Ligand binder design. Structure first.
Ligand SMILES: [Mg+2]
Ligand code: NA
Length: 281
């Protein structure tokens, strides 16, 4: 499906213009980066046995994903300010996020996101386990504080939410329970959630994850497998557009939904204010 579309897009500019014609207007970007220790070994097949956070003169999957999503959504960003958070390191585990800059200062453009990412990475202690509840809750807080302006949260992660040891008897882990609850609660806000999977995974349980999310007023969640798309044997510029479209083509209908539901521009009033920890640097 997305492959059939992207075959006719030669640049990210074309993808951006398409999102514009599909109804996307002023749109804000929030980025959450997975800093769990698993990043050390999930690059086995996908990244030459290097850490997914390994820095060099070639961008790692995080930098690549940021660049592609950043370039595509930049035209819709009126203030060009991108709240950025890390999670899954030793300072946050599955309980918190930390802001890329002290006092929660937003990054100025995706270029600064990239630069500041490279500054922070070598000073982190990677940990775990994996939950997306703190980063989704942080996004909720930002949306509410902005008085209900539309946001797209892009989570870039190298694993699914941590499962229960007793998952085979139908039990959810706290990480799963709180993450699913956050996804549902987020649908009461003008917020779209995109989970970008990098590394080896496994990612084969995501469609079933998606299928089991409880009923929401609109479908506010998308998973996209960066690795699978960028591993294809086809043109590089064409892999980029396919990724951008796969990650973002559902955003304009979601945006339209936040308008039809009258979520846009209003404060919900039931959003706990999550505080981001300082960057542990
Ligand atoms: Mg991980
Ligand atoms: Na913005």
């Amino acid at each position: 499906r997305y492959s059939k579309i992207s075959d006719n897009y030669s640049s990210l500019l074309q993808v951006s213009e398409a999102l514009g014609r599909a109804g996307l207007e002023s749109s804000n970007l929030i980025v959450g980066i997975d800093f769990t220790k698993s990043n050390e070994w999930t690059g086995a097949k996908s990244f030459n046995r290097k850490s997914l956070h390994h820095l060099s003169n070639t961008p790692n999957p995080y930098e690549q994903a940021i660049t592609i999503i950043g370039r595509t959504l930049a035209a819709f960003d009126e203030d060009n300010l991108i709240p950025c958070y890390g999670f899954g390191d030793a300072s946050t585990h599955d309980q918190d996020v930390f802001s890329f800059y002290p006092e929660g200062r937003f990054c100025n453009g995706f270029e600064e996101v990239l630069a500041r990412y490279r500054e922070i990475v070598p000073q982190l202690k990677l940990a775990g386990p994996t939950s997306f509840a703190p980063i989704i809750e942080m996004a909720m807080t930002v949306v509410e504080q902005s008085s209900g302006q539309y946001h797209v949260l892009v989570i870039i992660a190298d694993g699914q939410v941590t499962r229960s040891v007793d998952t085979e008897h139908g039990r959810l882990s706290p990480q799963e329970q709180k993450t699913v609850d956050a996804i549902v609660k987020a649908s009461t806000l003008p917020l779209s959630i995109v989970l970008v999977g990098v590394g080896d995974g496994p990612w084969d349980m995501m469609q079933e994850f998606d299928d089991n999310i409880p009923a929401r007023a609109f479908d506010n969640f998308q998973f996209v497998n960066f690795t699978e798309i960028m591993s294809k044997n086809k043109d590089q510029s064409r892999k980029e557009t396919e990724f951008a479209l796969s990650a973002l083509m559902a955003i304009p209908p979601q945006y339209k939904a936040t308008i039809e539901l009258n979520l846009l521009g209003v404060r919900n009033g039931n959003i706990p204010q999550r505080i981001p920890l300082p960057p542990p640097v």
